Amino acid sequence: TVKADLEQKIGYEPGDHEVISYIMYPQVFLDYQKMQREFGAVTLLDTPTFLHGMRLNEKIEVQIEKGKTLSIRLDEIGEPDLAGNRVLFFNLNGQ
Amino acid sequence: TVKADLEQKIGYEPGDHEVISYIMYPQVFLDYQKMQREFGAVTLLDTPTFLHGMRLNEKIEVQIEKGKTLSIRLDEIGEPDLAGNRVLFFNLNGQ
Amino acid sequence: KFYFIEVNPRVQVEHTITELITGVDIVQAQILIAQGKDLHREIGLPAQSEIPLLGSAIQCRITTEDPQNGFLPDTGKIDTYRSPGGFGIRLDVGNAYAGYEVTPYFDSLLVKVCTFANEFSDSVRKMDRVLHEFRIRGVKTNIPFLINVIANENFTSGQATTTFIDNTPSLFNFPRLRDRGTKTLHYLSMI
Amino acid sequence: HMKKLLVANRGEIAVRVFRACNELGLSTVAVYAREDEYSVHRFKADESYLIGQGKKPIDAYLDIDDIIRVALESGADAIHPGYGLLSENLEFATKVRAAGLVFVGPELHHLDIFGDKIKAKAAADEAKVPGIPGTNGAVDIDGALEFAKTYGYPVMIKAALGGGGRGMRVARNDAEMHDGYARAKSEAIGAFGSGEIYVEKYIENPKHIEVQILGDRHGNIIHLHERDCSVQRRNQKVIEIAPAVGLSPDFRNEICEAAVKLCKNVGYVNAGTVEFLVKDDKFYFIEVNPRVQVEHTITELITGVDIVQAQILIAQGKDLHREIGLPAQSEIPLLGSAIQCRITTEDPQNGFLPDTGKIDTYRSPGGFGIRLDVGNAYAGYEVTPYFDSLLVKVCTFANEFSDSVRKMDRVLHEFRIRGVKTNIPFLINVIANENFTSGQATTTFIDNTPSLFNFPRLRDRGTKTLHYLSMI
Ligand SMILES: CC(=O)SCCNC(=O)CCNC(=O)[C@H](O)C(C)(C)COP(=O)(O)OP(=O)(O)OC[C@H]1O[C@@H](n2cnc3c(N)ncnc32)[C@H](O)[C@@H]1OP(=O)(O)O
Ligand SMILES: CC(=O)SCCNC(=O)CCNC(=O)[C@H](O)C(C)(C)COP(=O)(O)OP(=O)(O)OC[C@H]1O[C@@H](n2cnc3c(N)ncnc32)[C@H](O)[C@@H]1OP(=O)(O)O
Ligand SMILES: Nc1ncnc2c1ncn2[C@@H]1O[C@H](COP(=O)(O)OP(=O)(O)O)[C@@H](O)[C@H]1O
Ligand SMILES: [Mg+2]
């Protein structure tokens, strides 16, 4: 029943370890899954990039897979608008 | 002779008015042709845009030709780099 | 047993596949006919018995309808656009460039891509490659639904009927897509 | 048995092989240099690996050991060399075949035979195809003078290893024969080293019909159709049209039959092309490229075939007419006529020197009958002088050659690449010429037409307006 509840709460069938971790920490696992759906696997970034983000005119390489490497470069940080939403001008994979 | 000199100086065949303007103002006509090759026909802009340039998130319409209206919007003004060249993020014709 | 339904007195959206299989420019012929010219003497089209049939062509319309939201049209900025090319690919793009703001006033169509080949299986494979190569981010498209329809065995056989879509619930099982570029950029911007 | 392919090339051809492999269902592995880190082909593959670390990028792409190591580490099965870098290198193909990896190309003896012009000339002379009258091989100044004394002027000095207007130049009289031979020997020992040199009987105003050859290891050898790359600027192909509309159909059939009989006598496998110098119903063998051509797209359009896909299927060992499913030789369709223009950063107002810089504006033309094979030409791309000057090649196909000419004119006027100077006005001038539209263009057509270099001024009222607005 908790496996079915976890499957209907995260959108896919979990393994034994996900069910066990949901039993131990119910809310913490759900928050982790929500931030995994939002920000993705942030475990692959460098520690200064994980903590302090990015600098202006800075190039980083993120190894998301074997043979896949994201070439992320930040070019401009925009001013906040009336809605409070800044616009960041990135250069992901050269584009 | 002055028509041939003006033709080789500006790279195209001039009219009678261009020749008679080059005769009276030799250096001024050459400077005008240099700014024509550099900035183009700036006489089609309105006076506040001609004098003070553009503002942040300001949309203007410039009619370069009957039926041709440029849609220029300035999105961001980048910081100057070490070489001193700022990068301006425009939106010309929606792109 | 074929039965008449209606006649559309216009050039249709799916005229591209007819253009590809016959080699005849439909819009150019339409304009030349409106000029008053002749089909087989001034336009230069061949006779009815000599009209070619150059393989099979497939067209799907990529719209902003989200199949996970009841095929309702989506709106918003288009962050990424990468139109595929190569042999046997023809694209009739509308308004789908990067940074384009999708408005709910007009049609949901972004790009109308077509694939043509000598064999229908090769056309199916080319369209599968095109659908996997298309990248439209910022708005939700019907690309996974088109991939599911293409991968179906009835469509590849060619015996698909009008009731084929409504009697196939397996076409709505869309795999999870882990966009590790957009999420990484979002997290980096947030931090 | 083959489930993963590696492409040891870059640019348009790498993405072309990636699309062919993804249509065939294979996984793709890419290689790139540090200066090629922003190339499109790096992100168009399932896996990408950095090769040639610490070296110049051109030599980095020729690193045989690094490519072999990447192919072994990534688990790739086949290696497609593309064209222009290692597709005719015998050592690279030998190491690939000896390392346990499939090479998507002809066999090693084919590369040995057709990699040198002397050996290829001897094989053609054995094959009873009409060659061009030349010397016996590596001849000196006196040997070159004997050819002029016996056969007669005009002549032409050609190297036995050069390619692309590099080791070849024209020759008319005795003293400039000495000067050209000295400069050709210097360029051969400089650029290549250990290269032979010959002198052949020159032909005034020839054509350059090329025949694409496909063949598997099962013995079936098929010509797809002919081409016409006669539009050349200093022996560099500019516009290639297929089929040769300025030629008779039976003469084109004779040329194709001669090419397929030469390849049958040799026993050719996979993709390759045979070049012929045509002048007044007399075709002369000049070269064979054991490659897939950059201008293979027009052949793909007119014959309805996928050359790269068939190349990979032949490299898999499949039968040509049973497993690939290709039709017979007599049933190969010739539908329409296709025109290919290769848009490069060579500025025609600057002596066709390549241009570098940021591409701040890119817009590709779609529509009916238009095929695009784009390299690295997206918006914001920084053009580097290390690699080729090609941005994007575009092919237009239609039933009538006039319709193809009009479609290419519409495409060239619809193309908008800004930030760098391109050869689009030159292509427009060549397209608008009456000699090209008839199809009777020769290899001296560009150099004898000064009207093609009169480019009209373009207003460019958007970029200059944005520049003025930014300045103010
Ligand atoms: C030439 C052709 O025929 S391409 C046909 C489609 N196949 C491929 O592109 C192979 C590479 N794989 C991908 O691009 C994607 O991962 C797909 C097709 C599997 C779809 O997965 P998605 O969830 O939608 O995107 P995903 O986050 O996993 O890809 C990682 C990012 O790095 C990019 N990337 C893909 N391959 C590589 C690579 N070898 N190196 C660096 N970056 C890469 C992707 O473009 C993607 O960026 P994006 O958001 O702009 O599209
Ligand atoms: C759809 C097809 O088949 S394209 C066939 C060719 N016809 C066209 O492109 C129609 C548009 N016309 C043009 O773009 C120009 O007149 C051309 C073809 C001469 C291009 O040469 P240029 O001198 O360099 O462009 P021009 O100085 O005249 O115009 C400036 C820009 O205004 C844009 N523009 C063109 N027409 C319009 C218009 N009706 N409204 C607003 N902007 C326009 C153009 O995109 C042009 O290019 P840019 O934005 O990148 O800077
Ligand atoms: N004998 C000749 N007469 C006239 N033109 C020639 C002659 N030999 C070569 N050319 C020209 O020089 C070019 C050289 O082509 P070729 O030697 O076959 O390939 P590559 O340029 O790759 O070495 C050809 O395109 C041809 O137009
Ligand atoms: Mg050649």
Side-chain angles (χ1 to χ4, degrees), chain D residues 77-111:
Chain D
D77 305 44
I79 288 182
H80 202 316
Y83 52 78
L85 281 185
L86 288 180
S87 198
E88 296 152 296
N89 190 28
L90 176 79
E91 173 190 333
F92 165 71
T94 311
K95 290 197 191 304
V96 159
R97 292 188 195 272
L101 311 159
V102 192
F103 185 82
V104 190
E107 310 280 342
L108 293 186
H109 57 267
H110 294 113
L111 263 83

Side-chain angles (χ1 to χ4, degrees), chain D residues 117 158 163-164 168 208 210 232 235 237 275 286-289 291:
Chain D
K117 257 138 149 187
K158 289 180 73 209
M168 311 75 78
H208 198 278
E210 274 191 304
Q232 303 192 3
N235 315 134
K237 309 185 169 154
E275 326 193 341
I286 44 167
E287 218 204 350
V288 155
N289 280 107
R291 284 193 286 104

Side-chain angles (χ1 to χ4, degrees), chain D residues 14-301:
Chain D
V15 197
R16 176 74 205 82
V17 185
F18 291 156
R19 287 152 177 173
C21 286
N22 201 205
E23 283 155 16
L24 281 170
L26 309 169
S27 308
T28 55
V29 183
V31 293
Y32 63 96
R34 189 82 269 173
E35 282 78 12
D36 226 6
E37 67 192 306
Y38 292 125
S39 177
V40 185
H41 80 280
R42 173 192 157 184
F43 319 106
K44 286 269 163 185
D46 304 29
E47 300 194 332
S48 57
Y49 297 94
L50 172 59
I51 67 166
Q53 209 270 348
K55 312 159 63 151
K56 53 178 280 171
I58 287 299
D59 296 16
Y61 275 103
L62 310 170
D63 207 313
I64 306 150
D65 204 7
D66 222 336
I67 293 164
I68 272 283
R69 180 201 67 82
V70 162
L72 290 163
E73 155 213 10
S74 55
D77 305 44
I79 288 182
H80 202 316
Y83 52 78
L85 281 185
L86 288 180
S87 198
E88 296 152 296
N89 190 28
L90 176 79
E91 173 190 333
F92 165 71
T94 311
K95 290 197 191 304
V96 159
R97 292 188 195 272
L101 311 159
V102 192
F103 185 82
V104 190
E107 310 280 342
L108 293 186
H109 57 267
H110 294 113
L111 263 83
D112 259 305
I113 283 159
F114 294 127
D116 210 314
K117 257 138 149 187
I118 304 307
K119 213 173 300 160
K121 166 245 288 178
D125 288 326
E126 182 294 339
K128 292 291 118 181
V129 280
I132 198 192
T135 52
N136 328 107
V139 301
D140 217 290
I141 287 286
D142 321 65
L145 286 151
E146 291 303 310
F147 186 80
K149 200 175 67 180
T150 50
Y151 263 93
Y153 276 145
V155 289
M156 162 156 267
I157 322 176
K158 289 180 73 209
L161 278 185
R166 303 252 296 111
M168 311 75 78
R169 59 221 38 81
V170 82
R172 196 48 191 81
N173 59 77
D174 293 310
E176 58 96 46
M177 161 56 48
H178 294 66
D179 316 337
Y181 188 81
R183 106 190 53 176
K185 287 307 286 181
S186 87
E187 202 154 304
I189 68 163
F192 284 166
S194 79
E196 306 98 16
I197 174 149
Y198 66 97
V199 159
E200 66 171 26
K201 169 214 188 272
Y202 179 80
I203 318 177
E204 290 284 29
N205 304 7
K207 296 186 163 167
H208 198 278
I209 289 89
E210 274 191 304
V211 184
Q212 181 91 24
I213 302 295
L214 268 177
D216 50 352
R217 50 165 197 86
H218 288 204
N220 308 328
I221 296 199
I222 177 175
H223 76 83
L224 301 180
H225 258 301
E226 66 273 351
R227 286 193 279 259
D228 195 358
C229 322
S230 43
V231 188
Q232 303 192 3
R233 182 195 73 84
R234 314 222 277 178
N235 315 134
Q236 307 321 113
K237 309 185 169 154
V238 173
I239 311 185
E240 310 96 319
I241 50 184
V245 286
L247 250 62
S248 174
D250 67 322
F251 188 34
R252 270 154 37 199
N253 198 2
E254 283 164 37
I255 293 155
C256 289
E257 278 156 3
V260 76
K261 114 199 175 192
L262 156 67
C263 294
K264 265 172 181 161
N265 174 49
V266 153
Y268 192 72
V269 76
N270 233 3
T273 189
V274 191
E275 326 193 341
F276 284 106
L277 269 189
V278 156
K279 178 68 182 300
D280 318 308
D281 221 291
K282 303 276 147 218
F283 55 93
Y284 308 92
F285 174 86
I286 44 167
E287 218 204 350
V288 155
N289 280 107
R291 284 193 286 104
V292 63
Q293 284 302 127
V294 53
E295 59 264 339
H296 71 299
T297 63
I298 49 186
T299 303
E300 285 201 44
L301 290 171

